């Protein structure tokens, strides 16, 4: 509350390892389909049931840019990133496999440079 403060918590290296973790994303072989934002021209259905579509290359111009206020906020993109996958995808297509993939990787390099 006022004047009462705890401990300071060292965030000084949260853009560098937020950064370091988008890369390890961006590289394995299962992003292709989260790579860049799903065509809403080409893509029928996808405009009108997904209300914020979100994709990698999106979650990097706005970490380059001071965009997330912090590391929380990165964390809900990337996360949305997976939840519109499954709202869209049937768990049993290269897609929605793909989705579930990238996810559990995405919270294992999560918890182990953070918690």
């Known amino acids: 509350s006022m004047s009462v403060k705890k401990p300071k918590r060292d965030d000084s290296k949260?853009?560098?390892?937020?950064?370091?973790?988008?890369?390890?994303?961006?590289?394995?072989?299962?992003?292709?389909?989260?790579?860049?934002?799903?065509?809403?021209?080409?893509?029928?259905?996808?405009?009108?049931?997904?209300?914020?579509?979100?994709?990698?290359?999106?979650?990097?111009?706005?970490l380059s840019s001071g965009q997330y206020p912090n590391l929380e906020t990165f964390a809900l993109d990337v996360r949305l990133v997976f939840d519109n996958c499954e709202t869209f995808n049937e768990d049993d297509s290269d897609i929605g496999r793909a989705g579930h993939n990238m996810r559990k990787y995405f919270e294992k390099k999560w918890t182990d440079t953070f918690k």
């Open 14 to 62: 949260d853009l560098a390892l937020c950064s370091m973790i988008l890369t390890e994303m961006e590289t394995h072989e299962d992003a292709w389909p989260f790579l860049l934002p799903v065509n809403l021209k080409l893509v029928p259905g996808y405009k009108k049931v997904i209300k914020k579509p979100m994709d990698f290359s999106t979650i990097r111009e706005k």
